[PDB]
């Protein structure tokens, strides 16, 4: 399909689930049971970019919503954010760079590195209920790896 995608969920290595904070923010937290359905279902798109056997470019939008994770400089610092797009032109095979993440297969875990800002990754905090953000450091206080779960569509 011109642009191929797949629906899925992500979970941090701490087993925290992602949910929508505001209209433009994601937060991570320990969730179980009935609460689990509050989690966000992404729609991962396989876009065009520099490819490898362990490094695939993707775009992460929300299922059925014209919102995409985007990387931008905000206050002279790489920043993660949800961005609105024309429901009619997206997704597309050739997404803009700010929308592109390199999906990296590590342990049996994943990492999402910004195509735009090398070595900047999608991260979560150890703490509960904090926002998902773009962190510039690996192997640290912050969490950079996740696992993914496929969902039926």
Helix-strand blueprint:
Layout: E1 5-12, E2 17-20, E3 26-29, E4 42-46, E5 55-62, E6 67-73, E7 78-84, E8 100-105, E9 110-114, E10 121-123, E11 130-131, E12 133-135, E13 146-150
Antiparallel strand pairs: 1-4, 1-13, 2-3, 3-11, 4-5, 5-8, 6-7, 8-9, 10-12
Structure explained in plain terms:
The protein is mostly beta strands and 153 residues long. It has a single domain (1-153), classed as Trefoil (Acidic Fibroblast Growth Factor, subunit A). The protein has no helices and 13 strands. The chain has strands at 5-12, 17-20, 26-29, 42-46, 55-62, 67-73, 78-84, 100-105, 110-114, 121-123, 130-131, 133-135, 146-150. The strands form four sheets. The protein has a six-stranded antiparallel beta sheet with strand order 9-8-5-4-1-13, with no helix packed on it. It has a three-stranded antiparallel beta sheet with strand order 2-3-11, with no helix packed on it. Strands 6-7 form a two-stranded antiparallel ribbon. It is classed as signaling protein. Keywords: interleukin, signaling protein. The assembly is monomeric. Human interleukin-1 beta.
């Amino acid at each position: 399909a011109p642009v191929r995608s797949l629906n899925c969920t992500l979970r941090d290595s701490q087993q925290k689930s992602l949910v929508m904070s505001g209209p433009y923010e994601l937060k991570a937290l320990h969730l179980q049971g009935q609460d689990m359905e509050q989690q966000v279902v992404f729609s991962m798109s396989f876009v065009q970019g520099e490819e490898s056997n362990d490094k695939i470019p993707v775009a992460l939008g929300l299922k059925e919503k014209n919102l995409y994770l985007s990387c931008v400089l905000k206050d002279d610092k790489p920043t993660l954010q949800l961005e609105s797009v024309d429901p009619k032109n997206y997704p597309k095979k050739k997404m803009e760079k700010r929308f592109v993440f390199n999906k990296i297969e590590i342990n049996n875990k994943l990492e999402f590195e910004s195509a735009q800002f090398p070595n900047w990754y999608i991260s979560t905090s150890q703490a509960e209920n904090m926002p998902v953000f773009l962190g510039g450091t690996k192997g640290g206080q912050d969490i950079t790896d996740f696992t993914m779960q496929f969902v039926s569509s």
